[PDB]
Amino acid sequence: AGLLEGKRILVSGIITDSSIAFHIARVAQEQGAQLVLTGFDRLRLIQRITDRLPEKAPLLELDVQNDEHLATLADRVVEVIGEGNKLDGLVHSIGFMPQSGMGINPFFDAPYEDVSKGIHISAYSYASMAKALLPIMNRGGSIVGMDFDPSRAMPAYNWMTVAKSALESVNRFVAREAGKYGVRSNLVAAGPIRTLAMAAIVGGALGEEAGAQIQLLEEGWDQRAPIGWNMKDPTPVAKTVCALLSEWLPATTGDIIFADGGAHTQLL
Amino acid sequence: AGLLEGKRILVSGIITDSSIAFHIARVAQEQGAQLVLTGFDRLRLIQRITDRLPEKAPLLELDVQNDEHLATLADRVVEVIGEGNKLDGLVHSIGFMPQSGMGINPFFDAPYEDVSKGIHISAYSYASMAKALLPIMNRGGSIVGMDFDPSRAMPAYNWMTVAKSALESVNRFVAREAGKYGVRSNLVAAGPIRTLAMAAIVGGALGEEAGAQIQLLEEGWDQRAPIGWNMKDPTPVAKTVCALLSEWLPATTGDIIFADGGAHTQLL
Amino acid sequence: AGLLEGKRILVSGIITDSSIAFHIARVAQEQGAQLVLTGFDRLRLIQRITDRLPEKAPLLELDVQNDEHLATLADRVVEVIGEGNKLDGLVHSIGFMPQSGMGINPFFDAPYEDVSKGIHISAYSYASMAKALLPIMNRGGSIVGMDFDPSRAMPAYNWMTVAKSALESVNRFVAREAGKYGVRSNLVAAGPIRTLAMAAIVGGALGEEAGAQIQLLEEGWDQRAPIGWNMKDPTPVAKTVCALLSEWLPATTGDIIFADGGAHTQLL
Amino acid sequence: AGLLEGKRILVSGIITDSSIAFHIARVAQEQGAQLVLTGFDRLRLIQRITDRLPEKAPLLELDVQNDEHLATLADRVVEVIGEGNKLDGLVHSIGFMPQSGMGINPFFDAPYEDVSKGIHISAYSYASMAKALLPIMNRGGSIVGMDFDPSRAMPAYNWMTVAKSALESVNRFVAREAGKYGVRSNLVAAGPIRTLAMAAIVGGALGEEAGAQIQLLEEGWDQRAPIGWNMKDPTPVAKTVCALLSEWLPATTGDIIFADGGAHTQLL
Ligand SMILES: NC(=O)c1ccc[n+]([C@@H]2O[C@H](COP(=O)([O-])OP(=O)(O)OC[C@H]3O[C@@H](n4cnc5c(N)ncnc54)[C@H](O)[C@@H]3O)[C@@H](O)[C@H]2O)c1
Ligand SMILES: NC(=O)c1ccc[n+]([C@@H]2O[C@H](COP(=O)([O-])OP(=O)(O)OC[C@H]3O[C@@H](n4cnc5c(N)ncnc54)[C@H](O)[C@@H]3O)[C@@H](O)[C@H]2O)c1
Ligand SMILES: NC(=O)c1ccc[n+]([C@@H]2O[C@H](COP(=O)([O-])OP(=O)(O)OC[C@H]3O[C@@H](n4cnc5c(N)ncnc54)[C@H](O)[C@@H]3O)[C@@H](O)[C@H]2O)c1
Ligand SMILES: NC(=O)c1ccc[n+]([C@@H]2O[C@H](COP(=O)([O-])OP(=O)(O)OC[C@H]3O[C@@H](n4cnc5c(N)ncnc54)[C@H](O)[C@@H]3O)[C@@H](O)[C@H]2O)c1
Ligand SMILES: [K+]
Ligand SMILES: [K+]
Ligand SMILES: [K+]
Ligand SMILES: [K+]
């Protein structure tokens, strides 16, 4: 019997096999969870990617900017998991900011239309997914979202950092709503992970100076972390998400759990 | 000679004589500052209100959602203060959230179109005003915005709290940009102030339960504050803003100064 | 197989069956851990109390102010667990402040001799236990201490709050040292728990006003917590400690995990 | 008329002309304050040093570990400032940690006798000076202490960081007591300043690796600070202390004001 034996968990945010959500899904299945996946836009690709997970998982389309996708989401989940069953967990692993809001593009030059799209996808959608799915979640259930510590400004991340600050605030209000259902809501603040997008940025996709600054940020992270930090290994992040989905942190909600090697607790 | 003798300071956000910005402007003029005011929408009213300030102050129209107002703002300020002169200070005292995002209206029921408007006005505009005016600000100058501590969720304030979380993040990035000009950027986190809007909310304009919850929040504030808190007296807040506009906190930037009676430092 | 199957864990701090450490020990044994217990002063009582745990556990004497107890502690643990074996976990559940430092006795009237004793037992000993036991802890092991959120002042807790602030700082340095051994160090910040000492304080053992203030603090905690807070039930706290002792938060160190119902994330 | 015109302010902590307190005293006198100084141990030296201040200031002996010095302090101040007069301000600029608690000496190897002495001088004395002097402080007065941000661990500073964490907690309780007198209590968190002691440490007085680590910490501070940081110039710190001693932050108490160039608001 695994950490999540028999639990029904919805996992958003898989796009490649380097997505943090891919490893969340893998570890959850290793620990006995039965998954429902949601994917955005490139559903043929996502299906082929998730064929590599240890167990079969039904895939549902979900664009979090599409009010109609959200209005049907709960019914579509029930079609998959069966009438009379509910979800035990919800993983939000969704983030986006248009290029104008990141990289070497000046902070002041991001038009609000772009910033607003990034905040819609990266922060507001944490509330609207909770709105859609709380009516079909069991008492004792768990909502978990992915965070990148925005308490201090940093180069290049720019308006994505602002979106994460908003997300942390949203999580504290979602916890108030979720508590009425006996459900917890928490974020995992991860250290940097070399996803396909992050590797491309370090390669210069958003400008050379931005790539240079993000590379220096990654190096200092492993240096500061008392137990080190391996940006090529998302398994410690996936395990921490699974910890929050289990019943082993039953009095934690509205909160942020750091899976970052301890880097944020050290100055140098 | 006053605390701000001869300094040229732009003050946004006056709408009535109970606006926090009205008292910021009054105290700044008492301390020798020469003001330029900006007003939104109801310019005849704002002119009549600000006739009551101790000294004459030119009034310029500024809707922070209007890109054309922002694109001409610096030139219009220069017309007023004179070619060859620059601003020494910028006060952002602007906030708005549509009713769906506050009060008894459920947190989950605020459509993103409404939330996005509130974040545009209450958070993004801190960056876009800095973008407009930094080119005409003197070294040693000071940008100050108004904050309401969003580190914990609270009843009724709902998505306005999320907007303040975003604003605090924006301020840390504005400080990075402003530092290139020798300019500081900081927020003042004020305790609750009985503006006309807040009195109406306590009177029930956003629902009875929301009025009840905000009234209880005000009462606990004075109880927790080691030096007390008078929501009917914005002068301590105005004085703190003037402190940040002066040269007496010359090594503080990207930061938040609490003018709240000490309430946030006490649990009970 | 339990969450802690086969792990060897040292648990300090049991004095009665309402001690938080008693429930940590019970849950750890329920999850397959093999325990070594340490007790202070009243070893006959502690032996009789811990006879009620689900499994036998050897008991060692440890006064954390006694340098000789600490200098022999590792050897005495090895005698119990066997040459060639090491500990996988260390639970610090130790706190004390003389009466002058708590309650209605004025904050200014606690002599430093008393405060220093309380800081020795409640904060410094977290470092000196780590110094004693890290040489016999396995890579991947876990040190966990008990915290009560001291980020804001509160009535009655007085100098115990100061000792907890010191403890949080000590934990960040212990994490630096422990990382060299592949060991994590973290605190669990618990909500209030009705131990025998806390029930006596609420009954007035430290003065009537202090009992009144602590009772009001307990009530507001359950009110603020989005999932509620039951001060008569330490099991959620024990489970959270066991979570940190397991391998399921492998990238968290130098950190504080809140097992408080979410109360610290809400203002009202 | 200066910022502190006519105010009577007690200033502790001068030992050389590079002491932060020397520059606090200089700026306060430049702004019209009438000072009383306190000095520890080397009173002939301190007298000769403070002969260089712009105005004469009476010097009183105060060892904060000496209960008799503290028990007579208020009477000795009244002898100097005149019967019927009170203090308007109190500056605590006192810190000490024995060598075992800093530098390359291992964190675990500092005996508690040494740590306790450092916490007595650096943290507890903030409370005991407030206890001594609040009875002779005017309503509207101000107590200010010097802080070095201890929210994250760092190399070399070791147990001094723990003492600063305790000091921040003490300040929140002193604010509760001081509020009964209408007095504010706050800390200024300064960036690193090249005092004589700090120059010697960088020169290796506490070991080569500790000097190397502190030098790297200083360099990163100026790099992170959006307005830069000059460790050879304590005037911005002195000005910030004077700001808190004035009436221009009248609603701030129990709090920490950062005079650090904004460095703590930036990660890289
Ligand atoms: N270093 C890092 O990679 C890092 C660090 C900390 C936190 N995080 C966060 O982890 C989460 C997962 O990101 P990742 O790094 O695994 O990258 P990723 O690119 O693999 O995943 C981002 C996902 O967001 C999805 N998404 C984008 N727009 C969407 C929309 N309109 N509707 C639905 N889904 C949408 C994409 O389809 C993709 O699956 C994000 O919140 C990210 O901010 C990442
Ligand atoms: N208790 C409180 O009142 C409280 C507490 C802390 C902080 N604050 C903040 O102080 C600031 C001032 O608010 P207030 O309480 O004085 O209320 P207010 O209603 O008097 O001022 C709000 C101002 O925002 C302006 N504004 C709205 N939309 C605008 C737009 N599109 N363009 C330009 N200006 C626009 C309004 O015209 C008005 O002048 C706000 O940021 C508010 O969040 C208020
Ligand atoms: N509400 C609460 O009870 C609460 C809340 C949060 C955290 N905590 C913390 O949890 C921990 C356990 O306390 P508890 O509430 O279970 O109370 P408790 O009285 O049951 O346990 C305190 C323990 O400290 C031990 N101790 C005292 N002096 C010692 C010494 N010199 N050497 C060794 N051990 C010594 C006592 O023997 C006792 O076992 C403490 O750190 C406490 O501060 C308690
Ligand atoms: N980089 C820095 O120098 C730095 C940074 C931030 C904060 N601070 C703090 O500023 C304060 C002033 O330190 P400084 O850097 O100016 O160094 P300093 O050596 O010039 O001043 C320290 C003072 O503490 C006094 N002191 C020590 N033991 C005492 C006792 N028993 N009784 C009374 N006074 C005693 C000394 O006599 C001396 O005047 C300290 O709290 C220090 O921690 C310093
Ligand atoms: K490291
Ligand atoms: K009060
Ligand atoms: K509740
Ligand atoms: K810099």
Side-chain angles (χ1 to χ4, degrees), chain A residues 1-55 57-268, chain B residues 1-55 57-268, chain C residues 1-55 57-268, chain D residues 1-55 57-268:
Chain A
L3 185 72
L4 298 174
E5 189 69 36
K7 299 196 181 291
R8 303 187 169 86
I9 299 166
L10 181 144
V11 182
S12 65
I14 294 173
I15 187 60
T16 72
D17 68 1
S18 65
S19 299
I20 293 173
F22 184 89
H23 296 266
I24 295 169
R26 176 183 48 81
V27 174
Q29 285 186 342
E30 292 170 358
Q31 295 301 314
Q34 302 180 315
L35 301 189
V36 180
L37 310 174
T38 71
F40 168 60
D41 189 46
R42 303 177 68 185
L43 297 169
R44 296 177 56 208
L45 160 69
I46 296 171
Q47 187 54 257
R48 160 188 50 112
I49 293 303
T50 61
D51 284 341
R52 273 63 189 191
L53 290 169
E55 314 276 340
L59 174 61
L60 303 178
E61 182 174 6
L62 172 62
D63 173 4
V64 294
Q65 293 196 283
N66 188 321
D67 288 343
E68 190 272 342
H69 290 190
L70 289 160
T72 65
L73 181 65
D75 286 340
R76 295 189 284 133
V77 170
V78 172
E79 287 164 22
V80 150
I81 68 177
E83 199 66 66
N85 295 324
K86 287 194 172 185
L87 297 172
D88 303 293
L90 188 182
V91 173
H92 181 285
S93 189
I94 290 174
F96 180 78
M97 180 62 65
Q99 293 189 350
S100 74
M102 295 183 72
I104 70 177
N105 311 308
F107 184 79
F108 286 154
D109 290 349
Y112 183 68
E113 173 178 30
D114 282 351
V115 175
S116 181
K117 183 182 181 182
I119 292 177
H120 193 170
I121 294 167
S122 309
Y124 180 87
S125 66
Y126 189 76
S128 57
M129 283 184 72
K131 179 193 184 174
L133 295 172
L134 277 168
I136 61 160
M137 292 188 73
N138 282 315
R139 297 194 68 82
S142 184
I143 306 171
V144 183
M146 297 307 311
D147 191 14
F148 188 59
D149 180 14
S151 60
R152 297 168 283 185
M154 58 208 122
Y157 285 90
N158 292 7
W159 289 97
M160 185 63 203
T161 304
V162 174
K164 290 303 193 192
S165 292
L167 173 67
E168 293 185 345
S169 209
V170 170
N171 174 57
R172 291 183 288 265
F173 284 88
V174 171
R176 301 177 63 100
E177 300 305 319
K180 310 168 170 175
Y181 298 83
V183 171
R184 289 166 293 126
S185 174
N186 293 285
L187 306 174
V188 173
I193 293 295
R194 277 284 186 104
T195 60
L196 177 60
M198 290 290 298
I201 294 175
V202 170
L206 291 187
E208 169 54 27
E209 307 98 85
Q213 294 163 321
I214 292 185
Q215 188 164 21
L216 276 168
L217 185 132
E218 294 172 341
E219 293 167 338
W221 211 283
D222 175 52
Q223 294 174 346
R224 280 198 305 291
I227 56 183
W229 180 254
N230 184 359
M231 66 182 183
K232 299 179 172 184
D233 180 20
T235 299
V237 178
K239 292 182 79 175
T240 304
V241 170
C242 286
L244 278 167
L245 295 165
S246 79
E247 77 272 48
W248 284 102
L249 293 108
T252 303
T253 194
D255 222 326
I256 303 161
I257 300 289
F258 285 77
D260 72 338
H264 79 113
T265 73
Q266 311 287 320
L267 177 49
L268 212 34
Chain B
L3 185 72
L4 298 174
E5 189 69 36
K7 299 196 181 291
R8 303 187 169 86
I9 299 166
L10 181 144
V11 182
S12 65
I14 294 173
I15 187 60
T16 72
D17 68 1
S18 65
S19 299
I20 293 174
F22 184 89
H23 296 266
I24 295 169
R26 176 183 48 81
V27 174
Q29 285 186 342
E30 292 170 358
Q31 295 302 314
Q34 302 180 315
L35 301 189
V36 180
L37 310 174
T38 71
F40 168 60
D41 189 46
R42 303 178 68 185
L43 297 169
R44 296 177 56 208
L45 160 69
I46 296 171
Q47 187 54 257
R48 160 188 50 112
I49 293 303
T50 61
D51 284 341
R52 273 63 189 191
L53 290 169
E55 314 276 340
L59 174 61
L60 303 178
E61 182 174 6
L62 172 62
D63 173 4
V64 294
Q65 293 196 283
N66 188 321
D67 288 343
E68 190 272 342
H69 290 190
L70 289 160
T72 65
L73 181 65
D75 286 340
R76 295 189 284 133
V77 170
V78 172
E79 287 164 22
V80 150
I81 68 177
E83 199 66 66
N85 295 324
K86 287 194 172 185
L87 297 172
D88 303 293
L90 188 182
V91 173
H92 181 285
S93 189
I94 290 174
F96 180 78
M97 180 62 65
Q99 293 189 350
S100 74
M102 295 183 72
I104 70 177
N105 311 308
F107 184 79
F108 286 154
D109 290 349
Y112 183 68
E113 173 178 30
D114 282 351
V115 175
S116 181
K117 183 182 181 182
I119 292 177
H120 193 170
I121 294 167
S122 309
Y124 180 87
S125 66
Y126 189 76
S128 57
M129 283 184 72
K131 179 193 184 174
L133 295 172
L134 277 168
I136 61 160
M137 292 188 73
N138 282 315
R139 297 194 68 82
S142 184
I143 306 171
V144 183
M146 297 307 311
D147 191 14
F148 188 59
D149 180 14
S151 60
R152 297 168 283 185
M154 58 208 122
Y157 285 90
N158 292 7
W159 289 97
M160 185 63 203
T161 304
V162 174
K164 290 303 193 192
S165 292
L167 173 67
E168 293 185 345
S169 209
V170 170
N171 174 57
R172 291 183 288 265
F173 284 88
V174 171
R176 301 177 63 100
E177 300 305 319
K180 310 168 170 175
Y181 298 83
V183 171
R184 289 166 293 126
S185 174
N186 293 285
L187 306 174
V188 173
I193 293 295
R194 277 284 186 104
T195 60
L196 177 60
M198 290 290 298
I201 294 175
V202 170
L206 291 187
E208 169 54 27
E209 307 98 85
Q213 294 163 321
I214 292 185
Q215 188 164 21
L216 276 168
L217 185 132
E218 294 172 341
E219 293 167 338
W221 211 283
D222 175 52
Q223 294 174 346
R224 280 198 305 291
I227 56 183
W229 180 254
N230 184 359
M231 66 182 183
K232 299 179 172 184
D233 180 20
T235 299
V237 178
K239 292 182 79 175
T240 304
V241 170
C242 286
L244 278 167
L245 295 165
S246 79
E247 77 272 48
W248 284 102
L249 293 108
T252 303
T253 194
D255 222 326
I256 303 161
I257 300 289
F258 285 77
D260 72 338
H264 79 113
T265 73
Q266 311 287 320
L267 177 49
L268 212 34
Chain C
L3 185 72
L4 298 174
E5 189 69 36
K7 299 196 181 291
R8 303 187 169 86
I9 299 166
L10 181 144
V11 182
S12 65
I14 294 173
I15 187 60
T16 72
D17 68 1
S18 65
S19 299
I20 293 174
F22 184 89
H23 296 266
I24 295 169
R26 176 183 48 81
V27 174
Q29 285 186 342
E30 292 170 358
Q31 295 302 314
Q34 302 180 315
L35 301 189
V36 180
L37 310 174
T38 71
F40 168 60
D41 189 46
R42 303 178 68 185
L43 297 169
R44 296 177 56 208
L45 160 69
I46 296 171
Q47 187 54 257
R48 160 188 50 112
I49 293 303
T50 61
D51 284 341
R52 273 63 189 191
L53 290 169
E55 314 276 340
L59 174 61
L60 303 178
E61 182 174 6
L62 172 62
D63 173 4
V64 294
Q65 293 196 283
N66 188 321
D67 288 343
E68 190 272 342
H69 290 190
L70 289 160
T72 65
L73 181 65
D75 286 340
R76 295 189 284 133
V77 170
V78 172
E79 287 164 22
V80 150
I81 68 177
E83 199 66 66
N85 295 324
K86 287 194 172 185
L87 297 172
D88 303 293
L90 188 182
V91 173
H92 181 285
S93 189
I94 290 174
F96 180 78
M97 180 62 65
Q99 293 189 350
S100 74
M102 295 183 72
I104 70 177
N105 311 308
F107 184 79
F108 286 154
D109 290 349
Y112 183 68
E113 173 178 30
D114 282 351
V115 175
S116 181
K117 183 182 181 182
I119 292 177
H120 193 170
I121 294 167
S122 309
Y124 180 87
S125 66
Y126 189 76
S128 57
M129 283 184 72
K131 179 193 184 174
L133 295 172
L134 277 168
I136 61 160
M137 292 188 73
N138 282 315
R139 297 194 68 82
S142 184
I143 306 171
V144 183
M146 297 307 311
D147 191 14
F148 188 59
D149 180 14
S151 60
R152 297 168 283 185
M154 58 208 122
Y157 285 90
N158 292 7
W159 289 97
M160 185 63 203
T161 304
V162 174
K164 290 303 193 192
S165 292
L167 173 67
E168 293 185 345
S169 209
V170 170
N171 174 57
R172 291 183 288 265
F173 284 88
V174 171
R176 301 177 63 100
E177 300 305 319
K180 310 168 170 175
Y181 298 83
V183 171
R184 289 166 293 126
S185 174
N186 293 285
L187 306 174
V188 173
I193 293 295
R194 277 284 186 104
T195 60
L196 177 60
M198 290 290 298
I201 294 175
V202 170
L206 291 187
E208 169 54 27
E209 307 98 85
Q213 294 163 321
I214 292 185
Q215 188 164 21
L216 276 168
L217 185 132
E218 294 172 341
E219 293 167 338
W221 211 283
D222 175 52
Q223 294 174 346
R224 280 198 305 291
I227 56 183
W229 180 254
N230 184 359
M231 66 182 183
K232 299 179 172 184
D233 180 20
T235 299
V237 178
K239 292 182 79 175
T240 304
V241 170
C242 286
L244 278 167
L245 295 165
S246 79
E247 77 272 48
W248 284 102
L249 293 108
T252 303
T253 194
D255 222 326
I256 303 161
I257 300 289
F258 285 77
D260 72 338
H264 79 113
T265 73
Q266 311 287 320
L267 177 49
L268 212 34
Chain D
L3 185 72
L4 298 174
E5 189 69 36
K7 299 196 181 291
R8 303 187 169 86
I9 299 166
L10 181 144
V11 182
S12 65
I14 294 173
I15 187 60
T16 72
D17 68 1
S18 65
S19 299
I20 293 173
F22 184 89
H23 296 266
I24 295 169
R26 176 183 48 81
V27 174
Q29 285 186 342
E30 292 170 358
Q31 295 301 314
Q34 302 180 315
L35 301 189
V36 180
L37 310 174
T38 71
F40 168 60
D41 189 46
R42 303 177 68 185
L43 297 169
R44 296 177 56 208
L45 160 69
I46 296 171
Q47 187 54 257
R48 160 188 50 112
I49 293 303
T50 61
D51 284 341
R52 273 63 189 191
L53 290 169
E55 314 276 340
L59 174 61
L60 303 178
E61 182 174 6
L62 172 62
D63 173 4
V64 294
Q65 293 196 283
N66 188 321
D67 288 343
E68 190 272 342
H69 290 190
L70 289 160
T72 65
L73 181 65
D75 286 340
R76 295 189 284 133
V77 170
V78 172
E79 287 164 22
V80 150
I81 68 177
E83 199 66 66
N85 295 324
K86 287 194 172 185
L87 297 172
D88 303 293
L90 188 182
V91 173
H92 181 285
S93 189
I94 290 174
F96 180 78
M97 180 62 65
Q99 293 189 350
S100 74
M102 295 183 72
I104 70 177
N105 311 308
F107 184 79
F108 286 154
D109 290 349
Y112 183 68
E113 173 178 30
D114 282 351
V115 175
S116 181
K117 183 182 181 182
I119 292 177
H120 193 170
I121 294 167
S122 309
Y124 180 87
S125 66
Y126 189 76
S128 57
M129 283 184 72
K131 179 193 184 174
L133 295 172
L134 277 168
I136 61 160
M137 292 188 73
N138 282 315
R139 297 194 68 82
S142 184
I143 306 171
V144 183
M146 297 307 311
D147 191 14
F148 188 59
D149 180 14
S151 60
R152 297 168 283 185
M154 58 208 122
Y157 285 90
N158 292 7
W159 289 97
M160 185 63 203
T161 304
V162 174
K164 290 303 193 192
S165 292
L167 173 67
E168 293 185 345
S169 209
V170 170
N171 174 57
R172 291 183 288 265
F173 284 88
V174 171
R176 301 177 63 100
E177 300 305 319
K180 310 168 170 175
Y181 298 83
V183 171
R184 289 166 293 126
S185 174
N186 293 285
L187 306 174
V188 173
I193 293 295
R194 277 284 186 104
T195 60
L196 177 60
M198 290 290 298
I201 294 175
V202 170
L206 291 187
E208 169 54 27
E209 307 98 85
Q213 294 163 321
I214 292 185
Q215 188 164 21
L216 276 168
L217 185 132
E218 294 172 341
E219 293 167 338
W221 211 283
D222 175 52
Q223 294 174 346
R224 280 198 305 291
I227 56 183
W229 180 254
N230 184 359
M231 66 182 183
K232 299 179 172 184
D233 180 20
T235 299
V237 178
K239 292 182 79 175
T240 304
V241 170
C242 286
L244 278 167
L245 295 165
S246 79
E247 77 272 48
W248 284 102
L249 293 108
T252 303
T253 194
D255 222 326
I256 303 161
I257 300 289
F258 285 77
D260 72 338
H264 79 113
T265 73
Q266 311 287 320
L267 177 49
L268 212 34

